[PDB]
């Protein structure tokens, strides 16, 4: 048995920014009250994990990153009621405490217990469950899925269908749900509309999936890497454009293509310039633009507020606007009922031991999602 | 009769920025096809008219400003079907052509025929109906209501109730409708919500009216002129705050007062800094901020897009989001049925000849709306 004991297991530790992960033994403490220890089965490589490496996203180091994953409960602490040992689970990097004003709001999902705004890199109790070479190691977004075992707070885990293929549904833990919900829940894309999606990685492809599910008539994919266009069209893009191919700014091109601006635009990259371009290319009186990309730490954009005064709506969202614990099980059930596809997002499946190779595939432009299998 | 003839009348001509208006004779051409010549009865002094003087809102000079008004049709050009001589009318500085993609959209109102985005200071046909000292004079927003007579395109006028008191309902031509619609239509303020209104002039007071009509539980007025607070409370503010009284930035004060951020905020001033402050003070996950104030020409704001990524919605609107020709007659009918009050906005009445004194009253901080009578 491992229950009640420290587990020594393999994890990918990030000791400092801009260095490879170190795949080595860590100690994982047993769960305390209202905590859950999970044996990980699969984890995806999201660009946001790379943001930790690159210093785009600031969180305390050293750290066990990883937030898009699925696994099986190994043990539960005192007082846990929502999962049991043996359950398939998805960690929730946006928690759902159920008690804060955001969790009680019909349209809020960015629970005040999150560790994204002001990252501490701990459990809810302000401590860590991880040790490596005798040193405490930080958590990441309450999840830390680049480990054979993690410990999460109960509000940071959802039970999912026991028959779930974990090597696919791990994507519901971040990239699929974020993109799909950004289209269907946050933007509320309408039937017959014209959409523009900036960035055709895993999250942007999921935005396209959502725009197509919502009945958009036109879905224009925008990326500087034309190698991304074929898969974008497979999942619903009607046109793709590469800004590098044009003498004019792409907002002008997209305004012309849409006969005066798009209904819905999405920034799914993480650049200040494309956030302003994406806003500008939606129709000035009734267009909606959604920021999905994580911006570089502490940098401000510049924009003319007449873009808003005319009638545009600008919003952003975490995790596609989904209340995480309510939504993740339902999304898995919908995947099991063939309501959407995840295979188009998966370009590579590697053992966990190849985490660094998986990140190199992302950084080279060659992958959408690599799934790492423990 | 005057039909088909040039009318010589008095108007308030602005020859130069930062100078008093010149009340002097102009020649007003008769209406061409699909044009309407109006004998003006009352016009309000909106801060946006002062923006023309200050160069905050750039439009070609020399100009006849004025856009918040009511009058009586003197004559109609060929093909006009929607008004007749003798009808009471409100000029529409946001037109409603009924034919463009915005007019056809369920939620758009910033008709593509507007003269606000890129002002030319003409009629729709690119020409002027005004001569002064033998020189052509620009129109303003297609309305030019600071004149005993104006000529407007048919898409820039609405017929209103024959029994309307024009010295009151002129406010439906800009400040009332803008503020009230910004709350009820654009923000869609909810029952029991907390609202923050930045700027307690005629437009901000009308925002408060709308927030109260929508059932807000708390309406916090924000102004650096504490003399504005008493009337704000009369029309529905529950608290007023002066940023100058506080050591901390007012976004932090309002976040504390609202136990984590307001539901709805409104910028009703026209400053870049208060547009960002108003966004920041709405709750980070589900708050909504609406820009109403006109920004200084060609200037960009700076902001951190993490304010949006967490879940905030930022939008702006023209004319309270109302489709102008559909909405103005209904707002007049509702006024006549006592569904809202206009008298709280009217602090001063002057004859048209005292227009410069009316602008002095606005600039000193003393007035809300001065109504000028022809
Ligand atoms: N809001 C959230 O909850 C949330 C969740 C998940 C991911 N994210 C962020 O979303 C973004 C996309 O993540 P991902 O899909 O995993 O990343 P990704 O797979 O790296 O995809 C990004 C895409 O953007 C393309 N690109 C880069 N620069 C430009 C440019 N100038 N113009 C057009 N295209 C360009 C690039 O070629 C690539 O295909 C990242 O910033 C993530 O951090 C946010
Ligand atoms: N979007 C539209 O369709 C539309 C329509 C009408 C008016 N406007 C604009 O709305 C704004 C308000 O117009 P109005 O009510 O006639 O003007 P106003 O009567 O000048 O009211 C503005 C108020 O802002 C207050 N104020 C100034 N600076 C600050 C500050 N730093 N912090 C807090 N309060 C401050 C000021 O004391 C005054 O009471 C102006 O910019 C207009 O141009 C826009
Ligand atoms: Zn919560
Ligand atoms: Zn992610
Ligand atoms: Zn129109
Ligand atoms: Zn106005």
- Nearest Cα neighbor of A25 from A39, A13, A42 is A13
Q: Are B37 and B150 in contact (CB under 8 A)?
A: yes
| Cis amide linkage into residue A174, ω under 30° from 0 | no
Q: Is B269 in the pocket of ligand 2 (CB under 6 A)?
A: yes
- Residue having the nearest C-alpha atom to atom 40 of ligand 1: A293
What span, in angstroms and rounded, lies between the C-alpha atoms of A334 and B49? 56
- Nearest Cα neighbor of A201 from A181, A178, A217 is A178
CA atoms in the 13 A half-sphere facing the CB of A113: 23
Instruction: Name the maximum alpha-carbon separation found in chain B.
Output: 65
Question: Which residues of B are known to be catalytic?
Answer: 46, 48, 51, 67, 174
Q: How many residues does chain B have?
A: 374
DSSP assigned state of A64: -
- Nearest Cα neighbor of A328 from A132, A43, A92 is A92
Burial A133-143 (b: 16+ CB within 10 A, else e): eeeebbbbbbb
Domains of chain A: 1-178+318-374 (3.90.180.10), 179-317 (3.40.50.720)
| Cβ contact A284–B109 (<8 Å) | no
CA atoms in the 13 A half-sphere facing the CB of A269: 21
Q: Rounded to whole angstroms, what are the CA distances from A289 to A196, A270, B308?
A: 9, 14, 11
Q: Is B270 in the pocket of ligand 2 (CB under 6 A)?
A: yes
Candidate list A34, A147, A174, A177, residue with the active-site label: A174
Q: Rounded to whole angstroms, what are the CA distances from A369 to A13, A141, A202, A372, B166?
A: 20, 20, 6, 9, 65
| Cis amide linkage into residue B62, ω under 30° from 0 | yes
What span, in angstroms and rounded, lies between the C-alpha atoms of B207 and A68? 44
Q: Is B295 in the pocket of ligand 2 (CB under 6 A)?
A: no
Residues paired with B222 in a beta bridge: B198, B241
- Phi/psi for B257 (5° steps) reads -60, -35
What span, in angstroms and rounded, lies between the C-alpha atoms of B356 and A143? 65
DSSP assigned state of B206: H
What span, in angstroms and rounded, lies between the C-alpha atoms of A282 and B315? 13
Residues paired with B153 in a beta bridge: B35
Burial B341-372 (b: 16+ CB within 10 A, else e): ebebbbbbebebebbeebbebbeeeebbbbbb
> In terms of CA atoms, which chain A residue is nearest residue B287?
A108
Q: Rounded to whole angstroms, what are the CA distances from A161 to A75, A150, B105?
A: 18, 20, 42
Q: Are B318 and A316 in contact (CB under 8 A)?
A: no
What span, in angstroms and rounded, lies between the C-alpha atoms of B268 and B294? 8
Q: How many residues does chain A have?
A: 374
- Phi/psi for B221 (5° steps) reads -85, 140
Q: Which residues of A touch B193 (CB under 8 A)?
A: none
Please give the distance of CA B81 from its chain centroid, rounded to a whole number. Answer: 26
Between CA A193 and CA A199, with CA A196 as vertex, the angle to 5 degrees is 150
Method used to determine the 3D structure = X-ray
Q: Are B133 and B8 in contact (CB under 8 A)?
A: no
Determine the 3-state secondary structure of B229 from DSSP.
Answer: helix
Count the helix, strand and coil residues of chain B and give each as a percent rounded to the nearest 5: 30, 25, 45
DSSP assigned state of B236: T
**DSSP secondary structure of A149-178:** EEEEEGGGEEE--TT--HHHHGGGGTHHHH
* Resolution for this experimental structure (Å): 1.1
Residues with Cβ < 8 Å from B189, sequence gap 6 or more? B183, B195, B210, B211, B214, B215, B216, B263, B264
Determine the 3-state secondary structure of A84 from DSSP.
Answer: coil
Q: Are A130 and A26 in contact (CB under 8 A)?
A: yes
Residues in B whose CB is inside 8 Å of some CB of A read 101-102, 105, 107-110, 112, 117, 259-260, 272, 275, 283-286, 291-292, 294-295, 298-306, 308-318, 321
What span, in angstroms and rounded, lies between the C-alpha atoms of A152 and A145? 10
**DSSP secondary structure of A250-278:** HHHHHHHHTTS-BSEEEE-S--HHHHHHH
Give the residues surrounding ligand 1 with Cβ less than 6 Å away.
A 46-48, 51, 174-175, 178, 198-204, 222-225, 228, 243, 268-271, 274, 292-294, 318-319, 365; B 309
Report residue B247 as tokens: 């050591």
- Strand A194-198 to strand A218-222: parallel, antiparallel, or no bridges (unpaired)? parallel
What span, in angstroms and rounded, lies between the C-alpha atoms of B93 and B66? 9
Long-range contacts made by residues A356-365, C-beta under 8 angstroms, separation at least 24? A356/A20, A356/A21, A356/A23, A358/A45, A359/A21, A359/A45, A359/A49, A359/A50, A359/A53, A361/A45, A362/A45, A362/A47, A362/A50, A363/A50, A365/A225, A365/A227, A365/A228
């Amino acid at each position: 048995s491992t229950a009640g004991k420290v587990i020594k297991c393999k994890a990918a530790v990030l000791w400092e920014e801009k260095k490879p992960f170190s795949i080595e033994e860590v100690e994982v403490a047993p769960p305390k009250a209202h905590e859950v220890r999970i044996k990980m089965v699969a984890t995806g490589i999201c660009r946001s994990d790379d943001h930790v490496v690159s210093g785009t996203l600031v969180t305390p180091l050293p750290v066990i990153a990883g937030h898009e994953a699925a696994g099986i409960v190994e043990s539960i602490g005192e007082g846990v009621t929502t999962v049991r040992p043996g359950d398939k689970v998805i960690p929730l990097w946006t928690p759902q405490c159920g008690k804060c004003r955001v969790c009680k709001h019909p349209e809020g999902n960015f629970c005040l217990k999150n560790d994204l705004s002001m990252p501490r890199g701990t459990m809810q109790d302000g401590t860590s469950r991880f040790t490596c070479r005798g040193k405490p190691i930080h958590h990441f977004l309450g999840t830390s899925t680049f480990s054979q075992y993690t410990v999460v707070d109960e509000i940071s885990v959802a039970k999912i269908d026991a028959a779930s293929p974990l090597e696919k549904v791990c994507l519901i833990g971040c990239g699929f749900s974020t993109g799909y919900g950004s289209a269907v829940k946050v933007a509320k894309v309408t039937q017959g509309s014209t959409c523009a999606v900036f960035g055709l990685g895993g999250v942007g492809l999921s935005v396209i999936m959502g725009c197509k599910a919502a009945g958009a008539a036109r879905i224009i994919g925008v990326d500087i890497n034309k190698d991304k266009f074929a898969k974008a069209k497979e999942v619903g893009a009607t046109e793709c454009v590469n800004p590098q191919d044009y003498k004019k700014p792409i907002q002008e091109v997209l305004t012309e293509m849409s006969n005066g601006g798009v209904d819905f635009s999405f920034e799914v990259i993480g650049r200040l310039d494309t956030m302003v371009t994406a806003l500008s290319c939606c129709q000035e009186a009734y267009g909606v633009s959604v920021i999905v990309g994580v911006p570089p730490d502490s940098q401000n954009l510049s924009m003319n507020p007449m873009l808003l005064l005319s009638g545009r709506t600008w919003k952003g969202a975490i995790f596609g606007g989904f209340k995480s614990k309510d939504s993740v099980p339902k999304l898995v059930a919908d995947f099991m009922a063939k309501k959407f596809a995840l295979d188009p997002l998966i370009t590579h499946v590697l053992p966990f031991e190849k985490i660094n190779e998986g990140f190199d595939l992302l950084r080279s432009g060659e992958s959408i999602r690599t799934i790492l299998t423990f």
